[PDB]
Design a protein around this ligand. Structure first.
Ligand SMILES: *[C@@H]1O[C@H](CO)[C@@H](O[C@@H]2O[C@H](CO)[C@@H](O)[C@H](O)[C@H]2NC(C)=O)[C@H](O)[C@H]1NC(C)=O
Ligand code: NAG
Ligand code: NAG
Ligand code: NAG
Ligand code: NAG
Ligand code: NAG
Ligand code: NAG
Ligand code: NAG
Lengths: 248, 360, 50
């Protein structure tokens, strides 16, 4: 089942500064009191990150995945529930679905016939896809989840492995440092080139709760990571940002 | 041996390296969990007929086959193209479980290159089939005194079956030239015939339940990989460790390092693996390298004497005429509280001389 | 069927080592005691050359 939403208000998407966000742990190796240089897919410091709002604003475009995605969510009341990944987003190819409904976190890899406007709607109405024919992988996991919450996620698709890095912070984007812990290592082995986030409506037509999300893209670069005595990343240097950091 | 000479001049020579030699091998892998649903395949109450043979795909789990061997009723375990012993070692991308019921003398037909009713009309294996076939008697589950008429097979078909093909069609087999038009009779036969199982039959006609495990490898990462051998963990001794493929030699001691829950291995300043997390037990263990030291030999000339003293550099004397120096432990020389000129330099103000070998 | 190969052995051979011992192999936890049965197979099986 699909429902067209015809009550949107036209507005261009915004842009803002990434500051020092988007950092994640490059590997599963503990390090204590050392500085380590890594050449990985990272988000540049002070980069131009796309800003979308949910307020009558209902921002659900479909964005190119590129080599990696940093997703930031300034969220309260848990409107944002999941993501959709794939190449063509239809039954022709195979797509990955990440959802967190009211009870449990579900990860599916199926050939979904996705709606043009997929969304969630007590919550008892689910209109995301019309069909799922060939399902090759299922994974059920723990619950991942004034504006009060900052949810940071990093998605990578390297060697057919889809890495989800996550961080939760009690809170435009705040200025500070927060390393993203690796959350899910997913063995999918499929091509991903385009993604779309899933929102939840509130029904009383419909009303959109106050939320904001940010989309940034990862590029291959070197970071100098600082590890404390407890193995927690506290600071990083982008070697290609400015000559001072290059010297560092 | 180190100096490549039979005469050694007076002095101190770094000759060898004290090492605690490895005694045992400790190899560990993660706990065998997320068990593949073989209980739903083998211990199901009700299988399917051989014409509509039931296929279940098996992926993203750990498959153990020692479950099957511990039940004495599973009489036939014949396997082609892979070792039955290496079933827990060699591992595959997908496992297809095909379940059906036949009679006793047709279990032979479940093989590559065989002919019969079941092979050509009901269930065909390819000539390059890599997998196992398992069969067992099921009189107590599939035979009825009035007769079990819920098990069917295909006796008539226009052409032979391709490998791993099914045919659930009930179209009337036309054996002649007159059109059947859906009505049976002469030269017009219903293709599905009943396996009327009864408990008083002979052994070649008693019902046998068959599960065919077919293993395939694709370009996908092979996510069906069975149990990996794990031995007990021994601590505080220099053993050969191997965790998740990562091998080495070291002393595994308790660690005060608080790992974050996502971290497995640990590195120091010099980028050497010095901390690890055991796969079976979520405890943190330090891998202290085996107690290496430089063995230096303090000797006078061989013309004078053959007595030697051994200096273990940077090794405490309790971990190896025993004297403790800041350079290390000196064994074979007796400390004298008198002070003389330096003859053989030891280090940290300590010198050795021959008068026995004395250190001062 | 005159050509036979050793399908089963406890350990790998050494270089230039020949094994002609026609002893039974224990493929499971249960000992075989020199008698064929479940997971007790003759080690030497013949090729079906056609
Ligand atoms: C919601 O709107 C979209 C876009 O207008 C609809 O998608 C199109 O539906 C027509 C129906 O005939 C198809 O011919 C087009 O090919 C569709 N476009 C795409 C890009 O797929 C969608 O069907 C609408 N939802 C419902 C329930 O009608
Ligand atoms: C971000 O991009 C938009 C258009 O893509 C541009 O107008 C804007 O100036 C950019 N901002 C920065 C800080 O580069
Ligand atoms: C992935 O898909 C894109 C288009 O959707 C295509 O251009 C690209 O070649 C694909 N990559 C692989 C490895 O299949
Ligand atoms: C959430 O999704 C799972 C998977 O589809 C489903 O089993 C569960 O019932 C859903 N929860 C609710 C409240 O609908
Ligand atoms: C995918 O689905 C279609 C229709 O549901 C089916 O015909 C096709 O065989 C499926 N592909 C595989 C590999 O099973
Ligand atoms: C490291 O951990 C200890 C004990 O858990 C704590 O006292 C200390 O403050 C931590 N260091 C930092 C920088 O948070
Ligand atoms: C079937 O039941 C037996 C009964 O003891 C049990 O031991 C076995 O593990 C079960 N599963 C399989 C796959 O045989
Ligand atoms: C793993 O095996 C050990 C061995 O006793 C057991 O104590 C432990 O509960 C198991 N599970 C985990 C998650 O460590």
């Amino acid at each position: 089942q699909c429902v067209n939403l015809t009550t949107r208000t036209q507005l261009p998407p915004a842009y803002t500064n990434s500051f020092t966000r988007g950092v994640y742990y490059p590997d599963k190796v503990f390090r204590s009191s050392v500085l380590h240089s890594t050449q990985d897919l990272f988000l540049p410091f002070f980069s131009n990150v796309t800003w979308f709002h949910v307020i009558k604003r209902f921002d659900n475009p479909v964005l190119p995945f590129n080599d990696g995605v940093y997703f930031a969510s300034i969220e309260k009341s848990n409107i944002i529930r999941g993501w959709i990944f794939g190449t063509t987003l239809d039954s022709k190819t195979q797509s990955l679905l990440i959802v967190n409904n009211a009870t449990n976190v579900v990860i599916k890899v199926c050939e979904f016939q996705f709606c043009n406007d997929p969304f969630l709607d007590m919550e008892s109405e689910f209109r995301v896809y019309s069909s799922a024919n060939n399902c090759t992988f299922e994974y059920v996991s723990q619950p991942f989840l004034n504006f009060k919450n900052l949810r940071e996620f990093v998605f990578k698709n390297i060697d057919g492995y889809f890495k989800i890095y996550s961080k939760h912070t009690p809170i435009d984007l705040p200025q500070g440092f927060s390393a993203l812990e690796p959350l899910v290592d997913l063995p999918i082995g499929i091509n991903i080139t385009r993604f779309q986030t899933l929102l939840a409506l509130h029904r009383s037509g419909w009303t959109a709760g106050a939320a904001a999300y940010y989309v940034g893209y990862l590029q291959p670069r070197t970071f100098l990571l600082k590890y404390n005595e407890n193995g927690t990343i506290t600071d990083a240097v982008d070697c290609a940002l400015d000559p001072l950091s290059e010297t560092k | 041996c180190t100096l490549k000479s039979f005469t050694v001049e007076k002095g101190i020579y770094q000759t060898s390296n004290f090492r605690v030699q490895p005694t045992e091998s400790i190899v560990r892998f993660p706990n065998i969990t997320n068990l593949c649903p073989f209980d739903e395949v083998f211990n199901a109450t009700r299988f399917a007929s051989v014409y509509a043979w039931n296929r279940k795909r098996i992926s993203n789990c750990v498959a153990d086959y020692s479950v099957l061997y511990n039940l004495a009723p599973f009489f036939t375990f014949k396997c082609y193209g892979v070792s039955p012993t290496k079933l827990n070692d060699l591992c595959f991308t997908n496992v297809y479980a095909d379940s059906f019921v036949i009679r006793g003398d047709e279990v032979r037909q479940i093989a590559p290159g065989q002919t019969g009713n079941i092979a050509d009309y009901n269930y065909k294996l390819p000539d390059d089939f890599t997998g196992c076939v398992i069969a067992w008697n099921s009189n107590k589950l599939d035979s009825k005194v009035s007769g079990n008429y819920n098990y069917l097979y295909r006796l008539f078909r226009k052409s032979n079956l391709k490998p791993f093909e099914r045919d659930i069609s009930t179209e009337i087999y036309q054996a002649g030239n007159k059109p059947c038009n859906g009505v049976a009779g002469f030269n017009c036969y219903f293709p599905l015939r009943s396996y009327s199982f009864r408990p008083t039959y002979g052994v070649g006609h008693q019902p046998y339940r068959v599960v065919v495990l077919s293993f395939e490898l694709l370009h996908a990462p092979a996510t069906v990989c069975g149990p990996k051998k794990s031995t007990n963990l021994v601590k505080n001794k220099c053993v050969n460790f191997n965790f998740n493929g990562l091998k080495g030699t070291g002393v595994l001691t308790e660690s005060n390092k608080k790992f974050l829950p996502f971290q497995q291995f640990g590195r120091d300043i010099a980028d050497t693996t010095d901390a690890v997390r055991d796969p079976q037990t979520l405890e943190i263990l330090d891998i202290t390298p085996c107690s290496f030291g430089g063995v230096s030999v303090i000797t006078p000339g061989t013309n004078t004497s053959n007595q030697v003293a051994v200096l273990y550099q940077g090794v405490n004397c309790t971990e190896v005429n025993v004297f403790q120096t800041r350079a290390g432990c000196l064994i074979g020389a007796e400390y004298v509280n008198n002070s003389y000129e330096c003859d053989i330099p030891i280090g940290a103000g300590i010198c050795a001389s021959y008068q026995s070998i004395i250190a001062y």
